[PDB]
């Protein structure tokens, strides 16, 4: 059967032929409660006390109990289980290349990494998730060290020189849709380039970047206060008023694409994709494949980062204290296996339940390449050139750039829009809203005794009235 | 897109790695999340707590 | 008076998110429930449901 399946596209032997042969069969949960499963065929080929002589079925591979997102974790059986859960959560937030035809699509939110790499340390289950063809992350030289104190409490130090070379650079694509609509006979929204002495209630912005069809052109730089779609609605000397589509605030970028079409009911429909390049920043979220999330705390240049005797600086420095309470030992084994993989010129195997891969075997393989067998290296201080007294664990580890950039979250309000009903500030950074000084904050300021600050927050920084 | 080779999908500006399994409703891709339910036509006997029933069979 | 969230907008941030959202199961027990038994990883989930992939928080 194995020999016939080795030539699947020659013999026309398939999985369905293997089912028809009486070799495999589908067992559901009710039937599984009556079967006797051998975990491996080693449970079958067992001596006088096999613990069971009446095995009815055998697992094809135990690592198939994982899902799509848990199958990208290297050495998942060397990690604490909540960390595998956290990586299963964060692998859906990792930016790579989400689909091949992303240039055709205008999704509302899109995220494309410049240089996604397949992991040096993969699982075999990843061969069917197409993670080799659409990867989300970069193999990074990670040194686990305390350097200048800027990686503490789940933070990373990044190499600024690496970042300048395109390390974890991404593209954010945002699509804006608008359409003319005939909401009544007299009402007629239309894509026109508006004129100041003709349109009612403009938002004091520039309109020169619009073409005379009312739509901005691809390749044009745009900023937060810029018009990209000029739509005017006829008012039943200001015969029409401004209902133009504006770019979202503080989201600078470049118009990548403009598409004009007809909707279902036959009106003009425009979709504009704006492209913005996201260079890695302090406060951007990065995660390894083991639940080791963390924001970038600082970025040092190559001459400031610690270096090995070969001149290798880490791309990312993570804190040692991220490891002990977490017990993400699979992170350390992935780093060691990735050092071995990058030296040997091969892709390391990190299928969960594999006795062919062992920490001692990886250590001996690493020592065969002129490195210390436990992955430590003598690092030198970047600032002074002196050897660090401790020897630093350093090697390639697969990291992921998560969707949570700080520039999509930074928000301040001095004064601005307020709600109609309660005359309090608005909701969210998208509406220039205020932050909620909630009930718990009120209790905390009661316990502080700061009554005038409590009055400022709850009366005259929110909604004074007489 | 049924039965099309990867070259035909690329000529239609579709990703051959795209799995399908979703709908396009007003241009938005919608996936139907599978929903768990109790199995039908099966007798299940439980013990309701703090109630007038010591045991209850349900089908 | 109808169940919500059966149809969801398909996640397209990563190919892994697309696959995970296309293979997603849902217990329609209210997330305000504070009993642990439907949220527990049952023994009978071996090989059927991933033991690691679950959301964090109310779900």
């Amino acid at each position: 059967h194995i020999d016939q399946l080795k030539e699947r596209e020659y013999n026309n032997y398939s999985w369905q032929d293997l089912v028809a042969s009486g070799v495999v069969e589908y067992i559901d949960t009710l039937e599984e409660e009556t079967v006797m499963l051998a975990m491996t065929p080693d449970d079958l080929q067992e001596k006088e006390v096999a613990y069971c002589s009446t095995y009815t079925h055998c697992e094809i591979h135990p690592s198939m109990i994982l899902g799509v997102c848990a199958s990208i974790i290297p050495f998942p059986d060397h990690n604490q289980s909540p960390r595998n859960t956290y990586q299963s959560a964060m692998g859906k937030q990792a930016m790579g290349v989400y689909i091949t035809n992303f240039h055709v699509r205008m999704d509302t939110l899109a995220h494309v990494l410049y240089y996604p790499q397949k992991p040096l340390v993969t699982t075999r289950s990843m061969e069917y998730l197409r993670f080799r063809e659409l990867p989300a992350g970069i193999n990074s030289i990670v040194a686990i060290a305390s350097y200048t104190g800027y990686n503490q409490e789940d933070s990373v130090i990044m190499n600024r020189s690496a970042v300048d070379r395109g390390f974890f650079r991404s593209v954010f694509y945002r699509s804006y849709k608008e359409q003319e609509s005939k909401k009544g006979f007299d009402q007629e929204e239309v894509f026109e380039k508006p004129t100041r002495e003709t349109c009612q209630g403009m938002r004091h912005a520039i309109y020169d970047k619009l073409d005379d069809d009312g739509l901005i052109a691809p390749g044009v730089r745009v900023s937060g206060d810029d018009v990209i779609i000029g739509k005017t609605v006829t008012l039943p000397r200001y015969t029409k008023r401004d209902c133009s589509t504006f770019l979202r605030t503080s989201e600078t970028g470049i118009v990548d694409q403009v598409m004009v079409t007809l909707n279902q009911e036959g009106y003009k429909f425009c979709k504009i994709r704006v492209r913005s390049v996201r260079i890695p920043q302090i406060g951007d979220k990065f995660a390894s494949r083991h639940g080791q999330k963390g924001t970038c705390g600082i970025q040092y240049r190559q001459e400031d980062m610690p270096f090995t005797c070969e001149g290798i600086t880490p791309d990312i420095i993570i804190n040692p204290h991220a490891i002990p309470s977490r017990m993400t030992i699979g992170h350390l084994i992935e780093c060691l296996q990735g050092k071995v993989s990058a030296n040997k010129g091969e892709i390391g195997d990190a299928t969960p339940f594999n006795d062919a891969v062992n920490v001692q075997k990886i250590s001996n393989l690493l020592s065969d390449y002129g490195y210390h067998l436990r992955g430590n290296e003598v690092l030198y201080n970047g600032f002074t050139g002196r050897k660090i007294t401790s020897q630093i664990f350093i090697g390639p580890t697969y990291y992921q750039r998560l969707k949570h950039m700080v520039d999509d979250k930074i928000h301040s309000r001095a004064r601005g829009p307020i709600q109609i009903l309660n005359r309090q500030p608005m909701e969210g950074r998208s509406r220039d809203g205020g932050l909620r000084f909630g009930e718990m904050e009120r209790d905390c300021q009661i316990a502080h005794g700061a009554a005038q600050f409590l009055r400022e927050r709850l009366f005259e920084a929110s909604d004074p009235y007489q | 897109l049924n039965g099309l080779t990867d070259r035909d999908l690329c000529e239609l500006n579709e990703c051959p790695l795209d799995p399908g399994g979703y709908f396009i409703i007003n241009g938005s891709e919608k996936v139907l999340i599978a929903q768990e339910k109790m199995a039908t036509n099966t007798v299940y006997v439980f013990a309701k707590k703090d109630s007038k029933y010591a045991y209850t069979g349900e089908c | 008076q109808a169940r919500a969230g059966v149809s969801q907008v398909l996640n397209r941030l990563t190919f892994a998110s697309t696959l995970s959202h296309l293979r997603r199961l849902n217990s329609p027990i209210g997330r305000d429930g504070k009993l642990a038994k439907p949220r527990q990883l049952h023994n009978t989930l071996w090989g059927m449901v991933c033991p690691a992939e679950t959301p964090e928080g109310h779900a």
């Binding site: 194995i2 293997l18 094809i60 799509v68 061969e127 | - | 296309l22």
Partner: peptide
């Protein structure tokens, strides 16, 4: 002939590759 334990890993990932060549990942939908 029986699959030897030294060939078992390669054989089991062959049959897993055959399963995912036929069914894929969204076969249930």
């Amino acid at each position: 002939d029986e699959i030897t334990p030294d060939l078992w890993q390669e054989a089991c990932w062959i049959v897993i590759s055959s399963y995912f060549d036929e069914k894929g990942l969204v076969r249930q939908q």
